[PDB]
Write an enzyme that holds these catalytic residues in place. Structure first.
Site, mmCIF file in Angstrom:
data_model
loop_
_atom_site.group_PDB
_atom_site.id
_atom_site.type_symbol
_atom_site.label_atom_id
_atom_site.label_comp_id
_atom_site.label_asym_id
_atom_site.label_seq_id
_atom_site.Cartn_x
_atom_site.Cartn_y
_atom_site.Cartn_z
ATOM 1 C CG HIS A 62 -1.674 -1.341 1.486
ATOM 2 N ND1 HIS A 62 -2.878 -1.495 0.809
ATOM 3 C CD2 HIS A 62 -1.586 -2.377 2.352
ATOM 4 C CE1 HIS A 62 -3.481 -2.587 1.194
ATOM 5 N NE2 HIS A 62 -2.701 -3.131 2.133
ATOM 6 C CG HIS A 92 3.786 5.582 5.941
ATOM 7 N ND1 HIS A 92 3.715 5.400 7.307
ATOM 8 C CD2 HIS A 92 2.637 6.192 5.582
ATOM 9 C CE1 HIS A 92 2.560 5.906 7.732
ATOM 10 N NE2 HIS A 92 1.854 6.408 6.720
ATOM 11 C CG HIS A 94 -0.446 8.492 2.735
ATOM 12 N ND1 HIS A 94 -1.256 7.374 2.814
ATOM 13 C CD2 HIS A 94 0.095 8.622 3.986
ATOM 14 C CE1 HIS A 94 -1.171 6.862 4.050
ATOM 15 N NE2 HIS A 94 -0.345 7.607 4.785
ATOM 16 C CD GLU A 104 -3.502 9.472 4.119
ATOM 17 O OE1 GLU A 104 -2.972 9.373 5.246
ATOM 18 O OE2 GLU A 104 -4.113 8.497 3.570
ATOM 19 C CG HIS A 117 1.543 10.097 7.624
ATOM 20 N ND1 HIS A 117 0.471 9.389 7.126
ATOM 21 C CD2 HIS A 117 1.280 11.416 7.573
ATOM 22 C CE1 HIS A 117 -0.438 10.312 6.769
ATOM 23 N NE2 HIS A 117 0.032 11.529 7.047
ATOM 24 C CB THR A 196 -4.874 7.728 7.186
ATOM 25 O OG1 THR A 196 -3.601 7.316 6.707
ATOM 26 C CG2 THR A 196 -4.698 8.979 8.063
ATOM 27 C CB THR A 197 -3.829 2.338 6.329
ATOM 28 O OG1 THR A 197 -2.998 2.137 7.445
ATOM 29 C CG2 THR A 197 -3.156 3.302 5.370
HETATM 30 C C1 LIG Z 1 4.596 -2.755 13.984
HETATM 31 O O1 LIG Z 1 4.875 -1.539 13.291
HETATM 32 C C2 LIG Z 1 3.820 -1.110 12.576
HETATM 33 C C3 LIG Z 1 3.958 0.080 11.866
HETATM 34 C C4 LIG Z 1 2.818 0.552 11.283
HETATM 35 C C5 LIG Z 1 1.524 0.035 11.314
HETATM 36 C C6 LIG Z 1 1.460 -1.215 11.956
HETATM 37 C C7 LIG Z 1 2.595 -1.743 12.569
HETATM 38 C C8 LIG Z 1 0.308 -1.993 11.972
HETATM 39 C C9 LIG Z 1 -0.598 -1.562 10.799
HETATM 40 N N1 LIG Z 1 -0.801 -0.086 10.933
HETATM 41 C C10 LIG Z 1 0.345 0.670 10.908
HETATM 42 C C11 LIG Z 1 0.097 1.978 10.514
HETATM 43 C C12 LIG Z 1 0.829 3.069 10.966
HETATM 44 C C13 LIG Z 1 0.582 4.373 10.570
HETATM 45 C C14 LIG Z 1 -0.457 4.688 9.704
HETATM 46 S S1 LIG Z 1 -0.855 6.397 9.287
HETATM 47 N N2 LIG Z 1 -1.152 6.584 7.835
HETATM 48 O O2 LIG Z 1 -2.049 6.699 10.101
HETATM 49 O O3 LIG Z 1 0.374 7.155 9.768
HETATM 50 C C15 LIG Z 1 -1.213 3.615 9.207
HETATM 51 C C16 LIG Z 1 -0.940 2.292 9.613
HETATM 52 ZN ZN LIG Z 2 0.172 7.447 6.739
#
Ligand SMILES: COc1ccc2c(c1)CCN=C2c1ccc(S(N)(=O)=O)cc1
Ligand SMILES: [Zn+2]
EC number: 4.2.1.1
Length: 258
Positions: A62, A92, A94, A104, A117, A196-197
Site C-alpha cells: 500500500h 512512510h 501517501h 491526506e 507520516h 489513515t489505513t
Molecule cells: C509494527 O509496526 C507497525 C507500523 C505501522 C503500522 C502497523 C505496525 C500496523 C498496521 N498499521 C500501521 C500503521 C501506521 C501508521 C499509519 S498512518 N497513515 O495513520 O500514519 C497507518 C498504519
Molecule cells: Zn500514513
C-alpha cells in the site's frame, strides 16, 4: 479481496471490515486554518532524531515503510500537545498520480502532492502493539510535500525504490537520517485522530506541520513507479494511496503559532 485504494476495495468500502471507519475521531481531516485556535499552553515541540537508527525499507503493497530499530531510547518526539515521550518506529508517504493531489490532510481544502507520516508510539505503553490499544498510544508527525526544488535528504530513499519495486520486497537501509526530511519551521496544527489505513485505530495525536518540504518532480515520479502488486503480477502503479478527508465531528484543531 484485501483492502486497497481502488473502486471496489478503496476508502468507501473500508467500513465493512473496519466499522471504526465511520467513528468519531477518524483521520485525515481538512484543516480549516481560520477555525483552528492558537493554544498558548502548548509547550514547544521537540523532535530529537540525532540517534535514529533505520533498519530497512519495505513495500507492503500500500506504501513503503522506512523502519527503525525502536528497542532503545532514540528518536523521540515530545512536547507540544504530547504528555511524555513518543518513540519513532517507521515513516512512510501517501502520494498522488498527479502533482495536484496526494496528501491526506488538506489545508483550507488544498491538496499537496504527497504527505510524509513519521509514526511514534507512547513509551508509557512499552511497545507499538500495546500502544495501539490506547487512546493516546501514537503520535504521527505529518509533513506536506510540494513539487519544486529537490529535497537532498530524500534522495537515498528515492534511489532504493528500484529494489522494492513490488509488494513484499525489502532492502537494508541503515544510517538513513530523517532529520533531512524536516522543514525549517516546526509550526503545527494538532488534533486527536486515527490511523489513515486499516485497521483505522483511533490512537493518534496528529501533529501536522504548516511548512511543506519541496521535493522535485523527478523524486515524486520515482514514487509513482512503485507497484501495488507483487513480482510476476500485472502492473498496478502505486499511486493515489491517500484517504480523503473525514468528518471532523466537533473535534477542535489547535495551532501552535499566532
Ligand atoms: C509494527 O509496526 C507497525 C507500523 C505501522 C503500522 C502497523 C505496525 C500496523 C498496521 N498499521 C500501521 C500503521 C501506521 C501508521 C499509519 S498512518 N497513515 O495513520 O500514519 C497507518 C498504519
Ligand atoms: Zn500514513
Amino acid at each position: 479481496h484485501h483492502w486497497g485504494y481502488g473502486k471496489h476495495n478503496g476508502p468507501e468500502h473500508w467500513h465493512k471490515d473496519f466499522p471504526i471507519a465511520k467513528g468519531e475521531r477518524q483521520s485525515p481531516v481538512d484543516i480549516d486554518t481560520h477555525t483552528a485556535k492558537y493554544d498558548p499552553s502548548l509547550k514547544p515541540l521537540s523532535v530529537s532524531y540525532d540517534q535514529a537508527t533505520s533498519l530497512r525499507i519495505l513495500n507492503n503493497g500500500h506504501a513503503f515503510n522506512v523502519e527503525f530499530d525502536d528497542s532503545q531510547d532514540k528518536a523521540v518526539l515530545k512536547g507540544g500537545p504530547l504528555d511524555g515521550t513518543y518513540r519513532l518506529i517507521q515513516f512512510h508517504f501517501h502520494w498522488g498520480s498527479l502533482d495536484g493531489q496526494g496528501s491526506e490532510h488538506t489545508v483550507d481544502k488544498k491538496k499537496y502532492a504527497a504527505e510524509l507520516h513519521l509514526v511514534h508510539w507512547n513509551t508509557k505503553y512499552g511497545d507499538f502493539g500495546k500502544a495501539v490499544q490506547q487512546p493516546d498510544g501514537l503520535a504521527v508527525l505529518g509533513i506536506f510535500l510540494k513539487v519544486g526544488s529537490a529535497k537532498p535528504g530524500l534522495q537515498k530513499v528515492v534511489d532504493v525504490l528500484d529494489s522494492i519495486k513490488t509488494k513484499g520486497k525489502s532492502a537494508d537501509f541503515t544510517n538513513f537520517d530523517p532529520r533531512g526530511l524536516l522543514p525549517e519551521s516546526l509550526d503545527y496544527w494538532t488534533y486527536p485522530g486515527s490511523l489513515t489505513t486499516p485497521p483505522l485505530l483511533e490512537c493518534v495525536t496528529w501533529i501536522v506541520l504548516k511548512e511543506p518540504i519541496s521535493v522535485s518532480s523527478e523524486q515524486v515520479l520515482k514514487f509513482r513507479k512503485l507497484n501495488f502488486n507483487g513480482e510476476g503480477e500485472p502492473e498496478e502503479l502505486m499511486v493515489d494511496n491517500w484517504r480523503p478527508a473525514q468528518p471532523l465531528k466537533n473535534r477542535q484543531i489547535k495551532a501552535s503559532f499566532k
